[PDB]
Write a protein that binds this DNA or RNA. Structure first.
Lengths: 200, 82, 91, 96, 108, 97, 82, 108, 97, 200, 200, 200
DNA sequence: GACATGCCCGGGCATGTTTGCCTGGAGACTAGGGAGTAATCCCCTTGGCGGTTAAAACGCGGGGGACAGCGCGTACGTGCGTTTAAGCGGTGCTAGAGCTGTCTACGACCAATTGAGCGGCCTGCAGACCGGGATTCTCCAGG
DNA sequence: CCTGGAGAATCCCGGTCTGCAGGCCGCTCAATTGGTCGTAGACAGCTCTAGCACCGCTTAAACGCACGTACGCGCTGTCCCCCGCGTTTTAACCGCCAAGGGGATTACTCCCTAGTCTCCAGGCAAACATGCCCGGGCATGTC
């Protein structure tokens, strides 16, 4: 369907200097996830793990939460709610916590909440914030995309943007950041080929 | 004002004309046939001559008018100018 | 060269709309128009020369029509030629 | 008495007129004939003395030339006398 | 600068007056040509052209032919007495002759 | 057997040729005659295909008109057969030669 | 290169020409006399046509050259231009 | 200005070259006339004029006359078949005819 | 009170040529009028034919060639030969003079 | 869903010598349709024309009808009902005559009918029969397929067999023929490739 | 719309040797109609005259008629009724005799009969047969096409065949012929191009 | 038909400084949409996206609506109503929100309205107004033209002007802006063509 | 890593309208041709009288036109056999036809001066008349 | 019937006389001739292309030739009537003369027409504008 509004994507670090971070995976044929700094674009497979680090200059107060939402990068398609294609919406692959139609899913977190906004029809996943553990300067969250970028009817080869927002108890905005995503098959191949044209 | 002048071409006159043509013996029916041919000749020449006279808006038929009328009919006449 | 084939065809359609003309029959008419043209233009030229005049007016053509065409055709031609000039000058 | 045979004097006239040049038709009877024919096309016309002479020279030359052909047509028919039909043939052959 | 009118239509004729004005003024027919001279001649040529075509058409209908041919122009010129004088010495291609047979030659 | 009396077939020919319009002189032989006469005045002379036809139609129209007058001259003498005298007389009356 | 082509005007060709003219009966001496008359006519026309060709400085005789040759002899020809 | 010299004198002719030049320019014969045109024509007219006068003079001597009259011009023209053809359609005033009598008409 | 307009005639040149062939022979005014009509006639023929030669060939000037060709078309064969000769000498001499 | 049976695909000419025929189209990159005799397989585009000839030894009686049905060629998937994928089943491309879920359609024929069997759950389209001219030897029918062979969820890159059956006015079986089909974006390129693959 | 049947296009001269004839027009820019024998195809403008001669070895019986019907040369489009485009169907250019939707029109014939078949929805024009006039060997009919071959919606650049059938009073077939047609803006320019391509 | 009046095209920014804006797309031969600042003219394809920005110095009050209307640019055609051609008027391509005979449409927006004036016979589409993002400086609307400029019977190769008007709840004129449009098959090629001609 | 599959950009055709060149007509001015008037006066019309040739008239009689008859030869009509003109190709290239450059040519004007035309006288040729005679034509005896 | 001599009529020659035309001379005006200048029609070279010329084979319509018969032309005789030649009588033409004035011609002045030059509109052909179709390369999922 179509939404009545378009979420916000304005980068906002906030008073706590919020910024994202990613790992340094390789580019082999048998790789599940890998991030490209030059492109700010993540390359991962369908339903696999996607570690995303949360860097902050100071520790937000307790009760802070982290939300993740996807929208179409192109403006004309923003009003369309980014959901799983009709095929991957019918198949039986729900983990018991994520609805069958949500694209993004957070694994390894029992306190996760999937929201289907009644006023905007948007899909989002929210998890409480936790300060970094001993020996790390950033908190890590694991996401999961349940549809390839080329899924007809869902994304339909249209690149998307994963909007990460740091929010408080009342849902206010403490910080926001986004990055392009490309859920595909064989991601190391693409990141290698993509970076070959980068140097050219 | 004047009538029956074609008869003026007397019989002896038609004889003399035929004599120049090498005619040795003439029949009585020639004099009536000749007057008919002579009249047609004058009508065509006189009609054309008067035409040139009317074009110039003159009232007297001059020699040149007769010379022109005779020329275009395939018969040129020397002596009377033109 | 310029030919009268376009006009000889129109004149026929005004007399016999349902009839046509052959290629040779049209060529004959072209020779006819040129022939009659030279005679009238030729005689009209001599009329202006005999009278010691330079310009060729409608009178030189009118008189040339009588000397060339027989008595019957001359009167009909003079009638048409008079209307054509009478209308042109009047319009 | 003394007289010639038919054909003698008629032949002697041929030598006489073929040698001369003057006109063979009377003058005044010809003038009234021209005016009688001229008045049909236009009335009150006048003629110059030379204009009439030009017509006589043209008429005699035409008739004389016509009798020459007429005489040949008569000779062609094995005759000596010229007939009206002899004149008609000579004219028709000449497109008259 | 009013719109132009073809001098042929201006006189109600079908033949071109402009052409006749050029032909009469060339070929050395005269030193000068009057404005009414082309109009007069154009009408004369049109009349004679209509007479032959009219008579020729009737000759075509006699043979029940839907087109005029050189033969039809011949019969139209020789049957008409006046045209036979204006065109007495003209020779027409494939014109033929009239079916004239002298009476003295007919059988009996 | 059967044989049309003399004169009957000639009448049907007079009507046929007077009604037709095609040429009566064979085209090729005439074309050679035109060139046999022109060579006497100039060699290597060429002729257009239309120029040869223009000569033939003019010659046939001349001979036909000559035979018509030649026929009348034969009738004037009350003969039916035309002879050279009839041709010479007709050409003499018209001033041909 | 060309000779005796005058004989090409066969006897039937002279008959048909006389037939169209109304002739019914022909004598034997007509053929030899006709060819003599035909050559004189055709010859005079050719000499005039060639004369125009020479003035035009051409090497080929066109139809117009024959039309002008015939026309001046009182033989106005229609069909081949004018 | 130099002592002029007539063009007829340059060509050695008796007829006038200046007059022929005019008549060629006028009469509506052409738009232009070449310099050698009247000189050529003046020579042709002078030649034909000498042919008739020469034969005419001889015809005058035969009749014991010392003066040419129209009758002599006639006899001279017809005695030369070349001039007879050139003037085959001309009528001479007071020229007469030739004394020709058909042999079939003579007696015996 | 003029007495007469100005005329023109070849009576002066016809009288000169006569005394070149017969120095002791005169000519009457009647015979002179015949010669004037002859010169004017022959002139109209040559000039008339030379005009069409330039017209057919699309030329606008009358040269000695148009007159030479017109003479060959008008005069017979014999008279044409001598006429062309005299004309050729006049133009030839006039060009040298 | 899965059907309770598998339609019989055995060729059956019947009492009228019922057979099929195809055209001789080339192999241009994007030729609309093209048939390969060596493979007995059709290559066409989605929603484009699909000519199919009908050959018979004798003209069937009037009222004879021709039905078409699709099944999976692979025995492992014959029990699955050939339907449009969940995506192309939701889009709005109905010509007014065909239901949304049906894969096969017929164009140019007004007297067409579409059936959804209540027992076997199979889809089908039926059209009357018409004989060719006395000089021709077959009648042509033009179908339309509304899904690519690679439509995930639907055919899923699994070849299918279009079973044609000649039936009387009551629906009894008079004849039956079949042929493989591939709905792709580049029919000629694929036909040439598969034919080359047949040699390779 | 669509039709329920397809007319016949089988050639048949019949007992009377029925054949078609066309004029020998040129190929200039100002040509309005011209026939190409090498292609059996006519090139003409919209609404202009298109003479079509009728040649027969013998005169058919009285009451014979001549029907002219156009059909799409391609089979898949045959069932579609060849009509004018929606644009040239609304414009006001009817001559009073021809309906606004018919493509072919016959001019100069009051006995013309335009048929909009109620059972087949086909368009056609029929005129009675008449022997050639005095001095002619064939009968000439004047047709008129009211749409270019490129009219969108109508023919849409799809070739068409002109079926000419000789039939009796009862409509029985006596003879049939056909020839392709192309209604364009430049018949001369187009015939040169097509023919010149045939010479190559 | 012909309208009784001609809508005004004079640019009027108003109290809120209403101004338009466009993107910076390339000139690829078949680019879906592209704008030329030198020509103030848009080049797009039929039924494709057409972004249009909305610049304002201050946020208008609530209820403000944006209307779009099309007219011919040539003075000798302004009085004509710009509608879809008779062909594209019959085709079934309605998105459920827009009527069939309307040229302009809006995609992505759910609260769109289409008007068919009763007094002027003019067509138009209306949508509410929305303010930009915090960091943004304009709002973007996406239109859709449903006929090529060469559609015979409709625009018929004649240029047009799309007049955008900012209106209140009742329809009073708050602002007005316009820009020429060209619906063609090769927008990029055509822009380059026209711009190249503009160099002269 | 190799293969299988779909979308975007570029190239090129297909199709309709705009722009450029040639021909005929319109508009305006300048110089000559034509028209009209006044006047002269040459040439045509008309009438008289007398002289006489030419035309009209009547008569005789011979020659030519005409019709009718008979002979036989040239011509037409028909048949079979031979010839070559028509037709329908193919092939080559000369010569017609058109274009573009350049020059010698004729038209045009003005100035200078001789040729040609008209008017005015005088002698020789041609015509006219009369007488001589040489030639031509016709009819009467002789053989 | 044919030939020769004589008579009669016509034609030709020679001398004398008279009148008009031809030829020449003188004067005056316009036309021919000189000698400049200018523009372009025509010659010239060049090229493309059409139409003519040449050759071949095949079909058969047309031309040759030969025979048989008859209508046709030619010559002859015999009417007979039409035209010629002659003398006589009557009529109109020729000639010379004079007068009247109508019409052609010339000269002068003025007004309208045609030629010359410049510019606009309609018809015909090529270039530009724009939609549709096919192929190549890359992107991306499958094995």
């Amino acid at each position: 369907p179509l939404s009545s509004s378009v979420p916000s994507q304005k980068t906002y670090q906030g008073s706590y200097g919020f910024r994202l971070g990613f790992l340094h995976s390789g580019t082999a044929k048998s790789v599940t996830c890998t991030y490209s700094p030059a492109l700010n674009k993540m390359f991962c497979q369908l339903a696999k793990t996607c570690p995303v680090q949360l860097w902050v200059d100071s520790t937000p107060p307790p009760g802070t939460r982290v939300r993740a939402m996807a929208i179409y990068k192109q403006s004309q398609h923003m009003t369309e709610v980014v959901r799983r294609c009709p095929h991957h919406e019918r198949c039986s692959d729900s983990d018991g916590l994520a609805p069958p139609q949500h694209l993004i899913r957070v694994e390894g977190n029992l306190r996760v909440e999937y929201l289907d906004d009644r006023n905007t029809f948007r899909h989002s996943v929210v998890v409480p914030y936790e300060p970094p553990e001993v020996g790390s300067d950033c908190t890590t969250i694991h996401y999961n995309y349940m549809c390839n970028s080329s899924c007809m009817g869902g994304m339909n080869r249209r690149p998307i943007l994963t909007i990460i927002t740091l929010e408080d108890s009342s849902g206010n905005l403490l910080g926001r950041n986004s990055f392009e995503v490309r859920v595909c098959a064989c991601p190391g191949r693409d990141r290698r080929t993509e970076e070959e044209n980068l140097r050219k | 004002v004047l009538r029956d002048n074609i008869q003026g071409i007397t019989k002896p006159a038609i004889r003399r004309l035929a004599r120049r043509g090498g005619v040795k013996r003439i029949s009585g029916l020639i004099y009536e046939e000749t007057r008919g041919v002579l009249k047609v000749f004058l009508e065509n020449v006189i009609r054309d001559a008067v035409t040139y006279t009317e074009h110039a808006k003159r009232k007297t038929v001059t020699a040149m008018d007769v010379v022109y009328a005779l020329k275009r009919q395939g018969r040129t006449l020397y002596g009377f100018g033109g | 060269k310029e030919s009268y084939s376009i006009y000889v065809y129109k004149v026929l359609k005004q007399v016999h709309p349902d009839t046509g003309i052959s290629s040779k029959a049209m060529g004959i008419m072209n020779s006819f128009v040129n022939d009659i043209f030279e005679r009238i233009a030729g005689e009209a030229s001599r009329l202006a020369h005999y009278n010691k005049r330079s310009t060729i007016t409608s009178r030189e053509i009118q008189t040339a029509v009588r000397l060339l065409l027989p008595g019957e055709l001359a009167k009909h031609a003079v009638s048409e030629g008079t209307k054509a000039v009478t209308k042109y000058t009047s319009a | 008495p003394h007289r010639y045979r038919p054909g003698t004097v008629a032949l002697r006239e041929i030598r006489r007129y073929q040698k001369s040049t003057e006109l063979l038709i009377r003058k005044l009877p010809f003038q009234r004939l021209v005016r009688e024919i001229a008045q049909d096309f236009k009335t009150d016309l006048r003629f110059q003395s030379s204009a009439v002479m030009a017509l006589q020279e043209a008429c005699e030359a035409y008739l004389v030339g016509l009798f020459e052909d007429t005489n040949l047509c008569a000779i062609h028919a094995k005759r000596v006398t010229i007939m009206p039909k002899d004149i008609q043939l000579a004219r028709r052959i000449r497109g008259e | 600068r009013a719109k132009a009118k073809t001098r042929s239509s201006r006189a109600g004729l079908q033949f071109p007056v402009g052409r006749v004005h050029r032909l009469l003024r060339k070929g050395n027919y005269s030193e000068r040509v009057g404005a009414g001279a082309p109009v007069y001649l154009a009408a004369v040529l049109e009349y004679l052209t209509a007479e032959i075509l009219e008579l020729a058409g009737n000759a075509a209908r006699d043979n029940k032919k839907t087109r005029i041919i050189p033969r039809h122009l011949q019969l139209a010129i020789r049957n008409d007495e006046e045209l036979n004088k204006l065109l007495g010495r003209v020779t027409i291609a494939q014109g033929g002759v009239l079916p004239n047979i002298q009476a003295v030659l007919l059988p009996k």
